[PDB]
Design a protein around this ligand. Sequence first.
Ligand SMILES: Cn1ncc(NC(=O)c2nc(C3CC3)cnc2Nc2cncnc2)c1C(=O)NCC(C)(C)O
Ligand SMILES: [Mg+2]
Ligand SMILES: [Zn+2]
Length: 313
Amino acid sequence: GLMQFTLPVRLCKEIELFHFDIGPFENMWPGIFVYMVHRSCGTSCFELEKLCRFIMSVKKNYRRVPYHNWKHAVTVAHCMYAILQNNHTLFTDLERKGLLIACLCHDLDHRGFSNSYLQKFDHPLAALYSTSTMEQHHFSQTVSILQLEGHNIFSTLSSSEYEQVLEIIRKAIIATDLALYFGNRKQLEEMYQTGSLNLNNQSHRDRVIGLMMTACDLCSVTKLWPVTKLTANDIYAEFWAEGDEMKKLGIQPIPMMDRDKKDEVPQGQLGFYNAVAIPCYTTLTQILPPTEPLLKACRDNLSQWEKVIRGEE
Ligand SMILES: Cn1ncc(NC(=O)c2nc(C3CC3)cnc2Nc2cncnc2)c1C(=O)NCC(C)(C)O
Ligand SMILES: [Mg+2]
Ligand SMILES: [Zn+2]
């Protein structure tokens, strides 16, 4: 009951900032997550015995892939922590509980392959879930872990609060399907501009939570340049492996996934910042002004990629 997690001074201060890197010490990541749950939610939100068992089971079900791994899970959860802490009064107790768990779970059992590759391979999961294939799988894995004995961190919620939190987590995880992000941000753009955006409208909150999930999920593009540049290698390591597997099915992959076209990466990143990241953090900043540091850091990293192209690095 009276057992706080405490971090060393430098982490205690930097964890509050959007651009915090959780570091290379894997054994500190569970503690960093519980620290965030306690400050974001309260020391009473979850039974610590049950939370610790949930965290370690989630860790076990992330694979040793270059990018879509346990470090990504905790990194995405930290970005959600920073958004929630800078927007104290905008979110219910249930939303704070649900979204930190949603982010930790959002890529459970990722294999390093896109929805497209599962479909072209004819993976069983593509037969079970025709769209948002991996994301329906991630939510499935989440419910499975919740139903292990001793793992149900929501057991102290009322029946109806329980159904609400699982529904928050389901929409949150599905929203991390980037194919759905484009239309969701366009709707939020129209609603913000025409002034119809209403956070007491549940379908509106859903859209806003969806954009937060995209923002947290892409938050590696919002770190200091050295962190972003080295994380870019990890995600390209997966893309190129997928390109290799596309070629094994006798399909020329998109340039993004063709390791023969590494020269094209700098311009590929420009397109991604311009088409995806900058629009995402812009719309998020318009709706949630205190999230501006993510937009600022993202613009700084676009600028660093422009410098790469111009031979200045
Ligand atoms: C055409 N292209 N080039 C690259 C690229 N994606 C990325 O670089 C990238 N994608 C993601 C999510 C989608 C899986 C996360 N992080 C990413 N980059 C990154 C960079 N630095 C640090 N961390 C992460 C796209 C693309 O995914 N385009 C979007 C679409 C396929 C819808 O056209
Ligand atoms: Mg994902
Ligand atoms: Zn992710």
